[PDB]
Chain A
Amino acid sequence: AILLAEINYQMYLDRQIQERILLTNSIMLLQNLKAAQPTADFS
């Protein structure tokens, strides 16, 4: 029983790290998309 509680807690930590990964990737993608803003120039 205690071991299963341990497993649950550590899985919670793993998912927190995964959410951190998600934030990092999303910020990077937004930076790229800002670098790739559409241009209104009609030449």
Chain B
Amino acid sequence: TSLYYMKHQDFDCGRVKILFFSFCLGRMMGDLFYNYVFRYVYNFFLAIFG
């Protein structure tokens, strides 16, 4: 089952700045939706399937 394990990507993020506040939401959106949501579901299915 390790042959289908989904890896933890590191997304480069565009640092947006709300007039004094620097933060890049690209990394947040990526590591949330792909890493902590989709990867969660896929790894859960694979972990059961083993």
Contacts and interface: CB of A to CB of B under 8 A. Distances in A.
A18 to B, nearest CB: 32
A41 B20 contact: no
A3 interface: no
A24 interface: no
A43 B20 contact: no
Q: Is the interface of A mostly helix, strand, loop or mixed?
A: loop
A43 B15 contact: yes
Contacts of A35: 20
Contacts of A41: 22-23
A39 interface: yes
B33 to A, nearest CB: 20
